[PDB]
Amino acid sequence: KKKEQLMDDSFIGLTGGEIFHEMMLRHKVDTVFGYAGGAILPVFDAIYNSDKFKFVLPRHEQGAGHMAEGYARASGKPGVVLVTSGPGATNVITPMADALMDGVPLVVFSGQVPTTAIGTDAFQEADIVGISRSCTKWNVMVKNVAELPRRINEAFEIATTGRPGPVLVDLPKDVTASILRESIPINTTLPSNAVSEFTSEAIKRAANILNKAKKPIIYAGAGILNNEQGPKLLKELADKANIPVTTTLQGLGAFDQRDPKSLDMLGMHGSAAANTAIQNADCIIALGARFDDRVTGNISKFAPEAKLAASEGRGGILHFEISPKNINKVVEATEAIEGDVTANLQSFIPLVDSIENRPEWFNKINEWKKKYPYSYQLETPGSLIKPQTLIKEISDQAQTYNKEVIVTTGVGQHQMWAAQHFTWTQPRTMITSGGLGTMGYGLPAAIGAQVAKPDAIVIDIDGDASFNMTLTELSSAVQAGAPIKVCVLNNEEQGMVTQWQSLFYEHRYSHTHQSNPDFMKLAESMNVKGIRITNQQELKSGVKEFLDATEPVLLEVIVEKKVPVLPMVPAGKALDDFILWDAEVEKQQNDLRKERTGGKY
Amino acid sequence: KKKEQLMDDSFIGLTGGEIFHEMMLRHKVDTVFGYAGGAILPVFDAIYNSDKFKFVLPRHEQGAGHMAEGYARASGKPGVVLVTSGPGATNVITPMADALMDGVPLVVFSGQVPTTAIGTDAFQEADIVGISRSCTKWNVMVKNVAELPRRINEAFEIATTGRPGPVLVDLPKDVTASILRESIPINTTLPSNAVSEFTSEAIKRAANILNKAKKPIIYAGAGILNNEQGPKLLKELADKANIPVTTTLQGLGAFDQRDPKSLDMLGMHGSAAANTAIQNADCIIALGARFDDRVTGNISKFAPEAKLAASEGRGGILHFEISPKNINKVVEATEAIEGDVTANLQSFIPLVDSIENRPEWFNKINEWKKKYPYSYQLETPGSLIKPQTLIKEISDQAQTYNKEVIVTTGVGQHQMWAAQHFTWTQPRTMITSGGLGTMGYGLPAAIGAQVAKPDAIVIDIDGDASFNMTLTELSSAVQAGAPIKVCVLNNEEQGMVTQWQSLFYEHRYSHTHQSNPDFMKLAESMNVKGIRITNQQELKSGVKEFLDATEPVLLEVIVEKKVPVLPMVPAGKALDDFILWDAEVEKQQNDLRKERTGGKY
Amino acid sequence: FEIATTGRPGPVLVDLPKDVTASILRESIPINTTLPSNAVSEFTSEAIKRAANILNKAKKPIIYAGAGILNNEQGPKLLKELADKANIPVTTTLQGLGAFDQRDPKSLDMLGMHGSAAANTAIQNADCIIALGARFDDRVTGNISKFAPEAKLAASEGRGGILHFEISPKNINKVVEATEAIEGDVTANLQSFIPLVDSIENRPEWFNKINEWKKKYPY
Ligand SMILES: Cc1cc2nc3c(=O)[nH]c(=O)nc-3n(C[C@H](O)[C@H](O)[C@H](O)COP(=O)(O)OP(=O)(O)OC[C@H]3O[C@@H](n4cnc5c(N)ncnc54)[C@H](O)[C@@H]3O)c2cc1C
Ligand SMILES: Cc1cc2nc3c(=O)[nH]c(=O)nc-3n(C[C@H](O)[C@H](O)[C@H](O)COP(=O)(O)OP(=O)(O)OC[C@H]3O[C@@H](n4cnc5c(N)ncnc54)[C@H](O)[C@@H]3O)c2cc1C
Ligand SMILES: Cc1cc2nc3c(=O)[nH]c(=O)nc-3n(C[C@H](O)[C@H](O)[C@H](O)COP(=O)(O)OP(=O)(O)OC[C@H]3O[C@@H](n4cnc5c(N)ncnc54)[C@H](O)[C@@H]3O)c2cc1C
Ligand SMILES: COc1cnc(OC)n2nc(NS(=O)(=O)c3c(OCC(F)F)cccc3C(F)(F)F)nc12
Ligand SMILES: COc1cnc(OC)n2nc(NS(=O)(=O)c3c(OCC(F)F)cccc3C(F)(F)F)nc12
Ligand SMILES: C/C(NCc1cnc(C)nc1N)=C(/S)CCOP(=O)([O-])OP(=O)([O-])O
Ligand SMILES: C/C(NCc1cnc(C)nc1N)=C(/S)CCOP(=O)([O-])OP(=O)([O-])O
Ligand SMILES: [K+]
Ligand SMILES: [K+]
Ligand SMILES: [Mg+2]
Ligand SMILES: [Mg+2]
């Protein structure tokens, strides 16, 4: 009688495909991104005309992958991908690697050739379990239909726990076509569903360290976004102990940048005020951030004041991190607090002393913010639109709609300028490829985010070269009914690469100018509204038309070429050893570039 | 003095990037396909404005990969790819897997993060050596500049010997930026530069078997194309011993299909005459073909007459194969002849008896060819153009120019119809993704083939869904000056998948209808000539304008929807258990489809 | 434990970090994880019927039995029942030794590199080979292209061949092509096989050869 209670017969008679369908329902999947093919056909037949979730069809499986990423980052739910064997599966490798580097919960289901054909170099056979091993948290090949529910449960659990990340489940055609003939453990048919004394002591110790600090700073990242209460507790800590807050690129929106305590973004292209502050802080509170090499600058020269404080027992680095692999990986933590940062903050904050004022510290911070704004060369009569100005215009106008605003980007200068010049205020509103840094990410990510948030304004701030990578997915946006807003910053160059070529290779631009299509005729061919802004006098009204649109829309803006992103901490330099914008220096750079290229650039 | 003669000092003082450049020259590389990025910048600076080879810039690294494949298959030279780390490298995974499955010599050079940053989850770091291990013959990461020339030599050698295939060489940024300070063995600075008694005896034994055969057949594949004399010796053998010849998809063009001895293509969608002949042959001469599962049909039921003949010592299977892994992998060879098929044919043919006539065998063969043409439902008044007719029109008109004609394809029905209805006569004129079967292959492969053969007519016969995958590379064709000819068979469906859904899933079309852009406005946006054929009366003049064009051109043809590719040997059936076209059956299928879909399809 | 003991049995390894085994369980776990464990496909059933019809035609059958028959207590019993019913000589591998009573007149002893020349001669001349839980290892088959000529001829003429009872798909058609492959536990499949096999009283010609070979090929 007990055995009957622990076994389940309800799936008997169903195909593997039909069992897949049922398990999607039980895992509350409301959206699937995918593309059909021979090996995955039994699953596609099972989900035929399903009213249980929305299916989104891209033009390319890489599109499906990045869409699912955008969906996951906007919603906080795992992004589900369904593709066929061989090239269908190998086409998702870049999105999987992308999701691993940025901690994105992705569940990839790939069709596979029949088990009778595996290992024979069969039609459309790829060793995707072998290939994807390094770009997934975990993967598996299902070998019989009886274990399919269990493997699906395991995939979703692994993808969404610890540091979230991609998993892949390989589905042989004869398994998904086969019918379950036996009962299975009832726990495998259902999804899911205290603090260690060691961590509790670490938290108490961390509190005592912070209570001594005279120059504290919070360094917050993507981890704080993986709980709804995250930003709330971050604000509570900063308010109680009176601490300035800087964030990573992936942490943007975790803290209200309108708050006086906001130091904006830190790192290679972050605020020099933020970079100066972290180099001078005696206590660094790292909340869900991994000390990436775009953030720390030269590692041996990173955070000198905090390391000194640690040695003198009056400060140091307090690292709230969920993955042991990323604790003491780059920098030694004075105290490591393992687990979910939000949960641990609940225990941390009541032990932290309330502080009214920090006159000396905040005097320095206010002085640094004043002398280190995001300065750049403004428009002049007759000049092209400056890309920094464009971003500001979009940020100002977008904030006046009574809708949430979500931003995705491509990779390059436009991405950095978007990060710098938007005013970030809400969690999960910056959706950008940071770790892997995949060009082409912007458009499909926007589609995925728009599907997750149908009532949001979703803006893809894209580069012309990045947009070229995946522009076929415009048709996908129309077919999905996703009214995304794409803004292409057209500088007719791979700007981020030409910046480095100008700086380190004496203006030798080696293969960094790709030809662009006519973006207005392209938009027309894709059945998308097109807007082109070519001069300063069209900027305001053009951006308004862009944002007022109630349909998918592509905005092209002609912007100044050969303009560097500043500030910049060059590779190998300390975080406070930065290059700042200077008008006279820019003019000299222009003359030098003109001379060296014979007036071509 | 001897040591001075064996060491070389000539590269001392050069950066790794400059050494790469020199080694490309020494390997007679005339074309490089690639895309820049941070990790590979030292190499791009070294090849800046090089007049030693043509550089081709795609819009996407997958484009570079498939272009290099098309280049390699058209030219017989290795296709060289140059990309950056991370997403640049992961984007080449599908082309590498593609090249492995189809035996294409591909040399991929990928930038990598500095050695000081490897294994730290660095900016744009992917474990590409781990990821690409299953989709390359061999890969390596260069760890110091002194070993760079040797690794480049090894890569080219491995890629082009045995069964050709892809290799990857990983290039850390600090290695390519570093300068060679020491002498290296002089053999590493230069590229390169008898039959075993066992094989010789096998050849003699194989000859004696063929000299007994009463119903011989040649089964020829891609391997015969890997030597310039290949097709010549194939013809010499067939003529001398009077043997009918069938080829694989990848073998198309190895034998002049106008020859009476031609049995056309065999396999799942091959001629029923070819399939019948191989099932009844007492001796099968396999020349550079791997008995793939799209060719053999049900393996246990494959070649019954040849297996009987082997057991009775009067025939069997004679396998000329260069890779031991593919000998006795699928079917047992009666005699295995290891090595280059063309070289071994030179030893084989003089031992083979000359034969004047085979009255009985060729009477059967001629009868089979007569009753098994590639039949289909012809146009009727007012109907759309039939896709089979379109292919015939292009084949007939293309053959009247005084230029070589090279065909690339996408993947699906159009691919099979192209294979069936073109008349193949010349080697290396069918460039198609067969093993992996990658949609999106057609356009970039055409660009690569066109660059390899600037005086050739290059036609991409593409599907609408396949073309959507990589249509951004149209801009790439213009920028490269490659006057490719793209013909999109627009049936507004994933036809190959709907064929299987009609056949096995009762006309349940699950997510197999993607929306298409306006292909004429698309062509215009890409600065490409556009032609649209919508009815029967525009077919001839439209195809002529297509072929007469001296610029990149996109032709869209509206063709009949929901038409199956026939003949068809269903998966699991014997090669001679095929479905044939029948007019009445097609009509009944149409009525059934109409009823089941409520008149929607 | 499940993986080690199912399919073809084999080794598994479980790695146990010191701090895991020293740590204390503080949370409830699914009750199924706290307990160990605890029909024939139509495809296999048809293969079995087909295999029976092939054996019922055979004039020179031989059983080639290996370690697989030992992985069920009823294994040797069913092997003997089959051999007795259809009157078939039995040879075994090194790992199959003890599966068949070698005192039985139908015993051909061990085959292979150092096996009986009587067993080796018999398998090279048999028109039907019944492989029971054996993997055609290279110490057993001799030269693969020259292995079992009479059984391959019989298969081509539709009057015999190789009938392979094997639990692991990886070892089916790995070395030699099976005329019929019967997937699953050999003992369980024999229960379905034997009632379809015709009872045979004598094989005068075949057993005359076998007895002659045993006489001239002692150890
Ligand atoms: C062109 C370019 C320029 C760039 N320049 C910059 C720059 O100037 N500044 C900058 O900041 N970035 C920059 N980057 C991005 C950079 O590379 C990284 O992607 C980014 O800094 C990572 O931020 P993160 O640590 O907050 O997020 P992640 O990489 O996702 O790390 C989050 C950390 O928090 C942990 N974590 C996750 N969930 C939890 C939880 N629930 N509880 C506790 N811990 C958790 C994770 O395990 C991980 O260790 C740039 C990228 C590009 C493409
Ligand atoms: C939708 C679709 C349908 C298809 N249907 C068919 C079909 O009906 N018919 C068909 O034929 N194909 C079909 N295919 C293609 C099929 O999958 C294989 O790609 C193709 O049959 C392989 O042909 P091949 O053996 O000649 O080439 P390869 O796969 O390249 O094999 C060549 C063999 O020759 C060997 N070799 C290479 N060089 C030499 C040398 N110098 N000397 C000796 N040996 C050498 C190689 O090692 C290899 O074993 C289809 C593909 C698709 C996408
Ligand atoms: C010096 C030396 C000399 C040797 N010479 C010989 C020789 O002359 N003759 C000889 O026979 N061996 C010889 N061997 C041993 C030989 O190498 C192999 O180990 C042996 O032949 C394997 O026998 P086997 O196939 O029965 O067992 P296994 O290797 O264990 O194969 C058993 C097969 O049955 C399958 N199976 C397992 N369980 C089941 C089940 N429940 N139902 C169905 N199928 C199942 C397995 O998957 C496997 O395919 C020699 C070894 C040495 C060291
Ligand atoms: C050209 O072959 C196919 C074309 N289009 C297809 O669906 C749209 N399929 N679907 C299959 N399935 S298959 O034939 O059993 C098969 C396959 O068949 C093995 C044998 F049963 F023929 C081997 C490897 C892969 C596949 C795959 F992935 F395609 F399913 N083959 C094709
Ligand atoms: C945002 O960082 C870059 C943007 N654009 C670039 O070139 C177009 N590069 N180039 C680099 N080189 S890097 O800084 O030494 C570096 C890197 O730096 C390590 C340390 F020296 F900072 C770590 C991992 C990869 C790279 C890579 F691949 F980008 F070279 N970084 C960027
Ligand atoms: C080539 C390159 N980076 C290397 C590279 C190569 N390939 C891929 C898939 N991704 C990346 N990041 C950049 S950042 C160029 C970006 O050009 P852009 O899209 O027009 O943006 P912008 O000009 O504003 O810098
Ligand atoms: C989806 C699919 N195959 C599965 C698939 C999925 N994804 C990739 C990258 N490649 C393949 N082969 C086909 S063949 C559809 C082909 O549609 P088509 O390009 O319009 O050609 P056609 O309609 O003539 O069959
Ligand atoms: K800001
Ligand atoms: K033809
Ligand atoms: Mg740009
Ligand atoms: Mg189509």
Q: Which residues of B173-208 are buried (b: 16+ CB within 10 A; e: fewer)?
A: bbbbbbebeebbeeebbeeeeeeeeeeeebbeebbe
Q: Is B306 helix (H, G, I), strand (E, B) or coil?
A: helix
A148 annotated ligand-binding residue: no
From the CA of B120, the nearest ligand is 5
Using a CB-CB distance cutoff of 8 angstroms, which residues of chain A are in contact with residue B525?
517-522, 524-525
Among B15, B51, B521, B569, the strongest candidate for a mutation testing the A interface, having the largest count of A CBs within 10 A, is B521
Return the ∠ at Cα B155 (arms to B152 and B158), rounded to 5°: 150
The dihedral through the CA atoms of A502, A504, A507, A513 has a sign that is negative
Ligand 3 atom closest to C66 (CA): 26
Whole-angstrom distance, CA of residue B333 vs CA of residue B320: 10
C135 annotated ligand-binding residue: yes
* Residue whose CA is at the smallest distance from ligand 7 atom 14: B412
Residue C198 CB-density burial (10 A; 0-12 exposed, 13-18 middle, 19+ buried): exposed
Query: Considering just the CA atoms, what is the radius of gyration of chain A in Å?
Result: 26
Residue ranges of E strands in B133-237: 138-141, 166-172, 184-185, 216-220
Comparing C-alpha atoms, which of C39, C49, C9 is closest to residue C182? C49
Q: Residue count of chain B, please give it.
A: 601
The dihedral through the CA atoms of B549, B554, B557, B561 has a sign that is positive
What determination technique applies here? X-ray
- Give me the residue label for tokens 């570093």: B178
Whole-angstrom distance, CA of residue A64 vs CA of residue A70: 10
**CB A143, CB C6: distance < 8 Å:** no
Whole-angstrom distance, CA of residue B539 vs CA of residue B393: 8
Phi, psi of B456 (to 5 degrees): -90, 150
- Give me the residue label for tokens 């007012």: B382
The helix-helix angle for A387-398 and A539-548 (nearest 10°) equals 40
Neighbours of A134 (CB within 10 A): 19
Q: How far is CA A535 from the centre of its chain?
A: 32
Closest partner residue to B45 (CB to CB) among A292, A438, A508 is A508
- Interstrand relation of B31-34 and B262-265 (parallel, antiparallel or unpaired): unpaired
**CB C90, CB C186: distance < 8 Å:** no
Whole-angstrom distance, CA of residue B416 vs CA of residue B300: 25
Residues B362 and B407 grouped into a single domain: no
Question: Which of residues A321, A354, A373 is at a domain's end?
Answer: A373
Which tokens go with B479?
A: 């920028």
Whole-angstrom distance, CA of residue B490 vs CA of residue B509: 17
Q: Is B38 helix (H, G, I), strand (E, B) or coil?
A: helix
Q: How far is CA A280 from the centre of its chain?
A: 29
**CB A461, CB A414: distance < 8 Å:** yes
User: What does DSSP assign to residue B86?
Assistant: T
C164 annotated ligand-binding residue: no
Residues A165 and A251 grouped into a single domain: no
Q: Using a 6 Å cutoff on CB, does residue B591 contact ligand 4?
A: no
Strand order in the sheet with A553-558: A430-431, A405-409, A457-463, A485-490, A553-558, A529-533
Whole-angstrom distance, CA of residue C115 vs CA of residue C108: 10
* Widest CA span in chain A: 89
From the CA of B34, the nearest ligand is 6
Q: Is A426 helix (H, G, I), strand (E, B) or coil?
A: coil
Which tokens go with B22?
A: 């020199």
Residues B252 and B163 grouped into a single domain: no
User: What does DSSP assign to residue C4?
Assistant: H
Neighbours of A411 (CB within 10 A): 26
Instruction: Write the CATH number for C100.
Output: 3.40.50.1220
**Cross-strand partners of A246:** A219, A264
Residues B259 and B404 grouped into a single domain: no
C-beta atoms of A6 and C32 within 8 A = yes
- Give me the residue label for tokens 């839980």: C133
The dihedral through the CA atoms of B35, B36, B42, B48 has a sign that is positive
Residues B346 and B411 grouped into a single domain: no
Using a CB-CB distance cutoff of 8 angstroms, which residues of chain A are in contact with residue B133?
130-131
Closest partner residue to A45 (CB to CB) among B49, B508, B516 is B508
Whole-angstrom distance, CA of residue A394 vs CA of residue A462: 13
Whole-angstrom distance, CA of residue A447 vs CA of residue A103: 19
Using a CB-CB distance cutoff of 8 angstroms, which residues of chain C are in contact with residue B304?
156
- Identify the helix (H) or strand (E) that includes residue A305: helix A304-311
Question: Which of residues A373, A404, A438 is at a domain's end?
Answer: A373
- In one letter, which amino acid is A566? L
N-term to C-term CA, chain C? 42
Whole-angstrom distance, CA of residue A6 vs CA of residue A185: 6
Which tokens go with B164?
A: 């050709």
**CB B406, CB B71: distance < 8 Å:** no
Residue ranges of E strands in B451-523: 457-463, 485-490
Residues A223 and A141 grouped into a single domain: no
User: What does DSSP assign to residue B579?
Assistant: B
**CB A215, CB A280: distance < 8 Å:** yes
Residues A572 and A593 grouped into a single domain: yes
Whole-angstrom distance, CA of residue B559 vs CA of residue B383: 9
**CB A280, CB A246: distance < 8 Å:** no
Report how far ligand 6's centroid is from the alpha carbon of A516 (Å).
Answer: 14
* Residue whose CA is at the smallest distance from ligand 1 atom 4: A294
Domain span at residue A269? Answer: 193-373
- Give me the residue label for tokens 């975080």: A575
The helix-helix angle for A93-102 and A61-75 (nearest 10°) equals 20
Whole-angstrom distance, CA of residue B589 vs CA of residue A460: 46
Neighbouring C-alpha atoms within 13 Å toward the C-beta of B191: 15
Using a CB-CB distance cutoff of 8 angstroms, which residues of chain B are in contact with residue C153?
311-312
What amino acid positions of A are annotated as catalytic residues?
61, 123-124, 173, 496
Report how far ligand 9's centroid is from the alpha carbon of B425 (Å).
Answer: 9
Whole-angstrom distance, CA of residue A241 vs CA of residue B332: 78
- Identify the helix (H) or strand (E) that includes residue B286: strand B283-287
What protein residues have CB closer than 5 angstroms to ion ligand 11?
B 463-465, 491, 493, 495
On the question of a cis peptide bond just before residue C38, with omega within 30 degrees of 0, the verdict is yes
Whole-angstrom distance, CA of residue B481 vs CA of residue B475: 10
Whole-angstrom distance, CA of residue B518 vs CA of residue B515: 10
- Interstrand relation of C128-132 and C161-166 (parallel, antiparallel or unpaired): parallel
Whole-angstrom distance, CA of residue A455 vs CA of residue A448: 13
From the CA of B419, the nearest ligand is 9
Whole-angstrom distance, CA of residue B368 vs CA of residue B353: 26
Residue C187 distance to chain B (closest CA, Å): 25
**Per the structure, how many domains does chain A have?**
3
C-beta atoms of A437 and B87 within 8 A = yes
Using a CB-CB distance cutoff of 8 angstroms, which residues of chain C are in contact with residue B307?
152, 156
Q: Using a 6 Å cutoff on CB, does residue A114 contact ligand 4?
A: yes
Neighbours of chain C (3+ CB pairs under 8 A): A, B
Among A113, A187, A192, the strongest candidate for a mutation testing the C interface, having the largest count of C CBs within 10 A, is A187
Neighbours of C175 (CB within 10 A): 16
Neighbouring C-alpha atoms within 13 Å toward the C-beta of A542: 21
Which tokens go with B517?
A: 């852009």
Q: Residue count of chain C, please give it.
A: 219
Neighbouring C-alpha atoms within 13 Å toward the C-beta of A108: 41
Whole-angstrom distance, CA of residue A62 vs CA of residue A59: 9
Instruction: Write the CATH number for A66.
Output: 3.40.50.970
Phi, psi of A435 (to 5 degrees): -75, -55
C-beta atoms of C31 and A6 within 8 A = yes
Whole-angstrom distance, CA of residue A236 vs CA of residue A245: 12
Report how far ligand 6's centroid is from the alpha carbon of B151 (Å).
Answer: 29
Report how far ligand 1's centroid is from the alpha carbon of A295 (Å).
Answer: 8
Residues B534 and B422 grouped into a single domain: yes
DSSP states of C129-190 as a string? Answer: EEEES----TTTSSSGGGS-HHHHHHHHTTS-EEEEEES-GGGTTSSS--SEEEES-HHHHH
Whole-angstrom distance, CA of residue A407 vs CA of residue A445: 10
- Identify the helix (H) or strand (E) that includes residue A83: strand A79-83
On the question of a cis peptide bond just before residue C204, with omega within 30 degrees of 0, the verdict is no
Whole-angstrom distance, CA of residue B467 vs CA of residue B453: 22
- Identify the helix (H) or strand (E) that includes residue B444: helix B442-452
Phi, psi of B363 (to 5 degrees): -65, -45
Residues A486 and A432 grouped into a single domain: yes
Whole-angstrom distance, CA of residue A91 vs CA of residue B93: 8
Which tokens go with B137?
A: 């013959």
- In one letter, which amino acid is A221? G
User: What does DSSP assign to residue B505?
Assistant: S
Report how far ligand 1's centroid is from the alpha carbon of A321 (Å).
Answer: 12
Which tokens go with A182?
A: 């036996």
Residues A52 and A138 grouped into a single domain: yes
- Identify the helix (H) or strand (E) that includes residue B273: helix B272-280
Phi, psi of B185 (to 5 degrees): -55, 130
Q: Find all residues with CB under 8 Å of A156, minimum gap 6, and list them.
A: A27, A78, A107, A191
Residue ranges of E strands in B28-86: 31-34, 54-56, 79-83
| Among A295, A345, A430, residue to substitute to test ligand 1 (most atoms within 8 Å of Cβ) | A295
| Among B35, B85, B112, residue to substitute to test ligand 6 (most atoms within 8 Å of Cβ) | B35
Residues B181 and B268 grouped into a single domain: no
User: What does DSSP assign to residue A44?
Assistant: H
Which tokens go with C44?
A: 């296999």
Resolution in A: 2.1
- Give me the residue label for tokens 């057991």: B311
- Give me the residue label for tokens 């009753």: B371
Residues A173 and A307 grouped into a single domain: no
Comparing C-alpha atoms, which of B54, B47, B55, B57 is closest to residue B19? B47
Whole-angstrom distance, CA of residue A416 vs CA of residue A568: 11
Comparing C-alpha atoms, which of C156, C139, C141, C122 is closest to residue C54? C156
DSSP states of A10-42 as a string? Answer: TTTT-BHHHHHHHHHHHTT--EEEE---GGGHH
Whole-angstrom distance, CA of residue B473 vs CA of residue B526: 9
Whole-angstrom distance, CA of residue C95 vs CA of residue A196: 53
Neighbours of chain B (3+ CB pairs under 8 A): A, C
- Give me the residue label for tokens 């391997």: B223
DSSP states of C21-77 as a string? Answer: HHS---S---GGGGS------HHHHHHHHHHHHHHTT-SSEEEEE-GGGGGSTTHHH
Report how far ligand 2's centroid is from the alpha carbon of B294 (Å).
Answer: 9
Using CB distances shorter than 6 Å, the residues near ligand 6 are A 410-414, 437-439, 463-466, 489, 491, 493-497; B 35-37, 61, 84, 87-88, 91
- Interstrand relation of B184-185 and B7-8 (parallel, antiparallel or unpaired): antiparallel
- In one letter, which amino acid is A515? S
Residue B351 distance to chain A (closest CA, Å): 34
* Widest CA span in chain C: 74
User: What does DSSP assign to residue B195?
Assistant: -
C-beta atoms of A116 and C169 within 8 A = yes
Q: Find all residues with CB under 8 Å of A24, minimum gap 6, and list them.
A: A32, A47, A52, A53, A80
Which tokens go with A218?
A: 């919070």
User: What does DSSP assign to residue B334?
Assistant: S
Comparing C-alpha atoms, which of B143, B168, B171, B146 is closest to residue B156? B168
Q: Is A149 helix (H, G, I), strand (E, B) or coil?
A: helix
User: Could you tell me which residues of chain C have a Cβ less than 8 Å from any Cβ in chain B?
Assistant: 145, 149, 152-153, 156-157, 177
C-beta atoms of B517 and A474 within 8 A = yes
From the CA of C171, the nearest ligand is 3
Whole-angstrom distance, CA of residue B20 vs CA of residue A522: 38
If DSSP states are collapsed to H, E and C, what string results for B210-250? HCCCCCEEEEECHHHHHCCCHHHHHHHHHHHHCCCEEECCC
**CB A521, CB B54: distance < 8 Å:** no
What amino acid positions of B are annotated as catalytic residues?
61, 123-124, 173, 496
Question: Which of residues A306, A341, A373 is at a domain's end?
Answer: A373
Neighbouring C-alpha atoms within 13 Å toward the C-beta of C60: 21
**Cross-strand partners of B264:** B246
Whole-angstrom distance, CA of residue B317 vs CA of residue B448: 37
